[PDB]
Amino acid sequence: RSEYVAPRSVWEARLAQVWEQVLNVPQVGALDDFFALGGHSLRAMRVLSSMHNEYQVDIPLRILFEKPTIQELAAFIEETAKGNVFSIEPVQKQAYYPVSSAQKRMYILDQFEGVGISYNMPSTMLIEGKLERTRVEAAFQRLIARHESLRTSFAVVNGEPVQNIHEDVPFALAYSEVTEEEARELVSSLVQPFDLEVAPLIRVSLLKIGEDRYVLFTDMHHSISDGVSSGILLAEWVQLYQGDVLPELRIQYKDFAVWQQEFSQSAAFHKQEAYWLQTFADDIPVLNLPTDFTRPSTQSFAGDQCTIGAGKALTEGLHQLAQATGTTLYMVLLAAYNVLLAKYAGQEDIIVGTPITGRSHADLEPIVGMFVNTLAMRNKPQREKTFSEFLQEVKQNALDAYGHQDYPFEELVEKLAIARDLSRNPLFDTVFTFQNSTEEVMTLPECTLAPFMTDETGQHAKFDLTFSATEEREEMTIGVEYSTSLFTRETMERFSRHFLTIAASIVQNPHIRLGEIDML
Numbered sequence: 001r002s003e004y005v006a007p008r009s010v011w012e013a014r015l016a017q018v019w020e021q022v023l024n025v026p027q028v029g030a031l032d033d034f035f036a037l038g039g040h041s042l043r044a045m046r047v048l049s050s051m052h053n054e055y056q057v058d059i060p061l062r063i064l065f066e067k068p069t070i071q072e073l074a075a076f077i078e079e080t081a082k083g084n085v086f087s088i089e090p091v092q093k094q095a096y097y098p099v100s101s102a103q104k105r106m107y108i109l110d111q112f113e114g115v116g117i118s119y120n121m122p123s124t125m126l127i128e129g130k131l132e133r134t135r136v137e138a139a140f141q142r143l144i145a146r147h148e149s150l151r152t153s154f155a156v157v158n159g160e161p162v163q164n165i166h167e168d169v170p171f172a173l174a175y176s177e178v179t180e181e182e183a184r185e186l187v188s189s190l191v192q193p194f195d196l197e198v199a200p201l202i203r204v205s206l207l208k209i210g211e212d213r214y215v216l217f218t219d220m221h222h223s224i225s226d227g228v229s230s231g232i233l234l235a236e237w238v239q240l241y242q243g244d245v246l247p248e249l250r251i252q253y254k255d256f257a258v259w260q261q262e263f264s265q266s267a268a269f270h271k272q273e274a275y276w277l278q279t280f281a282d283d284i285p286v287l288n289l290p291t292d293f294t295r296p297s298t299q300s301f302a303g304d305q306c307t308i309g310a311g312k313a314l315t316e317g318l319h320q321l322a323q324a325t326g327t328t329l330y331m332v333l334l335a336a337y338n339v340l341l342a343k344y345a346g347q348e349d350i351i352v353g354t355p356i357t358g359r360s361h362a363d364l365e366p367i368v369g370m371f372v373n374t375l376a377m378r379n380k381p382q383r384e385k386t387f388s389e390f391l392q393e394v395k396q397n398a399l400d401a402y403g404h405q406d407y408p409f410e411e412l413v414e415k416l417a418i419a420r421d422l423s424r425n426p427l428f429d430t431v432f433t434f435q436n437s438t439e440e441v442m443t444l445p446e447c448t449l450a451p452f453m454t455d456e457t458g459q460h461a462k463f464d465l466t467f468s469a470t471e472e473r474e475e476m477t478i479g480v481e482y483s484t485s486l487f488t489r490e491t492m493e494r495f496s497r498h499f500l501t502i503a504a505s506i507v508q509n510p511h512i513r514l515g516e517i518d519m520l
Ligand code: NA
Pocket: 017, 396, 399, 400
């Protein structure tokens, strides 16, 4: 046995799963060698067959011999377009391009459902320093030229929303001089709907609030961006303002969108789908959290947030527990979150929404566009299970989920029919996320950048609650954004403390049985 390294990519996960089945060996990791694990020619051919059947990827036998470890063979698949239906390559020029599944839903909701400013992505930044307004504008103009998503409009062609990519588009920086307090009210009123027929779907206001003090207001439509894209846009704006040259983009959003449409007709897509249909084939559980107030008959989006630090000692213990069990910190926390919900809800079958970046290939990482996907993660925190074995179930289901991530959540919801309810969300009523901090000031040559308004969107709650773990450098912090119509601050602060008690207990003794975990 090689040292265990847990799968780090979608292809490492997919391959490892296949090797485990074919070889009948558990816990195959990135450094494991097929032939060291006991495979020979017969079972190598079975691995090739299995990857063809499950993923429509044709791996020559010669390559398995040449690249006998999970990490090498995964790298080969990532770098190979031939006989790989998952490969995203530059597409032939066309008058219009299909929208992605996520774009299609946003378009339809925006146009037929009347979704106001719900798909806006506003941000504000306090800039203290010299700052040249014309250079601000010029950097955005370059960004718009660079990123096709910022030159994309939408039209309906043959009954489908489609992407209309524009050569060049008009853009001007909106400049104003206001009081700081006036800026605070403006920043809210400046959030306004976008006409989806008109590129660019980004707008910028620069507000001079003093001498060397500015607020930069930026907004864009979620159909052409996401959280990761906003980070890219910010970083590249700062670089472009300094006059830096940015690296060329091999692949664009329309390439991904065309691929997704082609992929939808493949045997591989049917297998991606089949996993999810099987997973939710039986009785789909509805989370029964105790609420302080009666659940409204229509969904309420009013939200609030609370945050608490886990402490250095516990954060370190959780890291070591992940290390010790062959899991990620993400998995340990998700596992702990499932037991938290199980105890509050008095249930042993629970679905938690887990957002993923959707950027499962190197080429997708630098693209500005809508990639974020959600996986409905189902687990069964039964009282008799040890946390250790439950955590392994969470790991296994996570890896399986990541291996079948190329099925749009939009398709799953429609394909499963409905057990819907307007007072709650499809498949899951809570979301779990885990992040690694991010800088309060990244700075410019003559300026300093920082937040202006209280940041993020914690006042709006799409789900009953969203549980967020953030590794802040000196500790992991636990954030809960919750529906004001359902929970008091007191209840949610206690909910958070109970998570930390569960976390402490499982670090103390990972083999404790779920029912024996004294949460209080
Ligand atoms: Na697996």
